[PDB]
């Protein structure tokens, strides 16, 4: 009765150097009840696009939805033209082709809609896919690499459903304040699936694909997780942890030992968002069952994985300050609402959340950043106690200060997201590619309902 963990197709180019992605609506079943869902190349979620560093691929994108959408390639160091800006809106029945030039270390990135004001809803409906970047360096390590066997993507997402089974998503005052949270946890679209893993090392490419919920991975029997990669790729050495917090939109790759016939679970532990943990995420929650099989796998975990460049001197680097702000009444409303779950004048919430006192204006980039030079961006969330995972397009950056303190070792490598939660973060960013006004990059909170209600800025390079 325990469903098998679905494995996204790992797609490579055809003989024409092309990959096709179709965006469309279908049906899925959750807990025995059908729901209308959206997917790439299917009814729900999407495939994993395989890229090779230093090689070009062209992606043909067909929008079969009845509304506009866009595609954001989260974590890719690509020109702003790839996401597209206004030219990046794909009308119903429209086609968009993008040629991806992959010039960054091996990493697990992802892709998802980014229509402003509607990103939360389109992700909630089902749209997300993966990007697997490979390079020469990672292949020489002889990591677990049999996709779907000992090298497995694990996209973890919550959803809220109505009584009839349909996805229950509404961007209203309360969801704009706190985010969209559900009580049903999905793993590659399935409820508590199991994966059969050969003996030895099992590699999990973890993605927190929730709109607003932070996760904290561990195992049911407290066996450790060996973190080998963050958002932007390999760490210099594996970092062993007993638990692994993962913010919305973040990825980590971990190895876990499969050493006998005893099944065990990947779980997620309670997280305080504000300072409340709400059922059914107020105690450890299963994510998926790992079922050992008698076959042994040959993946290895070397002592050294990669090399990170030394941080440059901070003297002389441009400093950019970004102040996140939540509307005080959304902030208050959200605190009271969570306190109860845990236990007029013309206001428009669609532009109520802000950066540097401005809600996102698609026609006015806030600044231009330098191309090819390190900058220090300082992001403050001092006005409220909510979690804002801050994401910057076009770069894999280094965290200098995460929410007031130097980053943990497994978060000190390549990142595209930094925690901001009532304190101040500082990141060292470099943009290798152009993004003109008509194809501007974005920087924003990745709690999707916050960015949909104004907590985003555009910038050019
Ligand atoms: Cu994203
Ligand atoms: Cu936020
Ligand atoms: Cu974004």
Residue numbers in the entry: 30 to 372, 399 to 516
What does the published report state?
CueO, an MCOs from Escherichia coli (E. coli), together with CopA, a P-type ATPase, comprises a copper efflux (cue) system that resists copper stress under aerobic conditions. CueO can catalyze the oxidation of cuprous ion (Cu(I)) to the less toxic cupric ion (Cu(II)) in vivo. Previous analysis of the crystal structure of E. coli CueO has highlighted that it adopts a canonical architecture consisting of three similar cupredoxin-like domains linked by peptides. Very recently, we characterized the E. coli CueO G304K mutant (hereafter, G304K) from the metagenome of the sludge in a chemical plant, and found that catalytic efficiency of the mutant towards an organic substrate in the presence of excess Cu (II) was 2.7-folds higher than that of the wild-type enzyme.
In the present work, we report the crystal structure of G304K at a resolution of 1.49 Å. In the G304K crystal structure, although the T1 and T3 Cu atoms are fully occupied, T2 Cu atom is depleted. For G304K structure in native state, the occupancy for one of T3 Cu centre (Cu3) was as low as 20%, suggesting that it was almost depleted. When we examined the mutant protein crystal, we found no evidence of a Cu ion at the corresponding site in the structure. In the G304K mutant structure, the R-loop is not trapped in the mainly hydrophobic pocket, but sways away the core domain of the enzyme. Because of the bulky side chain and positive charge of the Lys residue in G304K mutant, the R-loop could be significantly repelled out of the hydrophobic pocket that is mainly formed by the MR helix. Noticeably, compared with the N-terminal part of the R-loop of the wild-type CueO (with or without excess Cu ions), the N-terminal part (residues 299–307) of the R-loop in the G304K mutant crystal structure significantly swayed in the absence of Cu ions. In contrast, the placement of the C-terminal part (residues 308–314) of the R-loop was almost not changed. Similar to most of the reported crystal structures of CueO, the loop (residues 370–398) near T1 Cu atom is disordered in the G304K structure, suggesting that it is flexible.
